[PDB]
Amino acid sequence: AKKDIMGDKTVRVRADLHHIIKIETAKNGGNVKEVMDQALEEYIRKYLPDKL
Amino acid sequence: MGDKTVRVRADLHHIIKIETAKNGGNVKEVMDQALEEYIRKYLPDKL
Amino acid sequence: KDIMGDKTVRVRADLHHIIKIETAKNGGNVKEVMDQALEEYIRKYLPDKL
Amino acid sequence: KDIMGDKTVRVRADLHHIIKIETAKNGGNVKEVMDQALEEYIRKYLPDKL
DNA sequence: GAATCACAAGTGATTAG
DNA sequence: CTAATCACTTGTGATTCG
DNA sequence: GAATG
DNA sequence: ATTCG
């Protein structure tokens, strides 16, 4: 529901990690944002699971 | 190589924003950690 | 005309993919590649129209 | 077959217009020329990728 | 089918702490 | 000095035109 | 691919 | 069958 109604934010990550994701989303599907979303969700599900 | 701007869900960002404000840290550090951990998990041979 | 926008055009997915990879690996973006690609084509084939 | 989906891309609007205008005079379309320009670009710069 | 559009995703530029 | 956010740029599925 | 003797 | 996108 918060996923639904809310929108975007931006954050600056290590360019070397971002470059990896760029190559990857290029070769295989997807895009930078949806990896970030997933990387972040999994972190929260790992370290902060009461928040999801 | 420094940083690159990326977009993320505002609802997840917010969760990190609230938590790093309450307890230690900032958002960028967490996002970098998550990303790094994501990559080690799913794209281990990269980096 | 520093100012100067884009028109959009639909290109072979297989070629687009090749460029998508390359511009990620190395520098650049898709438009950038198209802008150069097209100017070279015009210079090569109809340079008197520039 | 030899069939291939497409992917939308941005391009310098002046260069597009040169092609639009020139293809108008005869039969052609802008897409045909873009596909050709992109390819000649890839053959020139990335010959082993296609 | 080619050509176009509207918004989504990308990111250098810029401001807040 | 950086993290954080802005606002201009690119990207492209969806849509139009016919 | 919808219509212009 | 061809024009217009």
The CATH number covering residue D8 comes to 1.10.1220.10
The reply to whether residue C21 touches residue A25, judged by beta carbons under 8 angstroms, is no
Question: Structurally, how many domains does chain D consist of?
Answer: 1
Q: Which residues of A touch C25 (CB under 8 A)?
A: 23, 26
β-sheet bridge partners, residue A13: B4
CA-wise closest residue to A42 among D46, C49, B31: B31
b (16+ CB within 10 A) / e for D5-41: ebbebbbbebbbebbeebeeeeeeebeebbbebbbeb
Resolution of this deposited model, Å: 2.6
Q: Experimental technique used?
A: X-ray
Task: Classify residue A48 by burial, with Cβ atoms within 10 Å: 0-12, 13-18, 19+.
Answer: middle
Q: Which amino acid is at D12?
A: R
Q: Is the CB of D29 under 7 A from strand H?
A: yes
Contact A36 B41 (CB under 8 A): no
Q: Do chain A and chain C touch with ≥3 beta carbon pairs under 8 Å?
A: yes
* CA-based nearest distance A30→chain B, Å: 14
* Nearest partner of D35 among D21, D19, D49, judged by Cα: D19
Q: How far does D33 lie from chain C, in Å, by closest CA?
A: 9
Domain span including residue B34: 1-47
Instruction: Give the one of C11, C37, C49 whose C-beta lies nearest to D22's C-beta.
Output: C49
DSSP A10: E
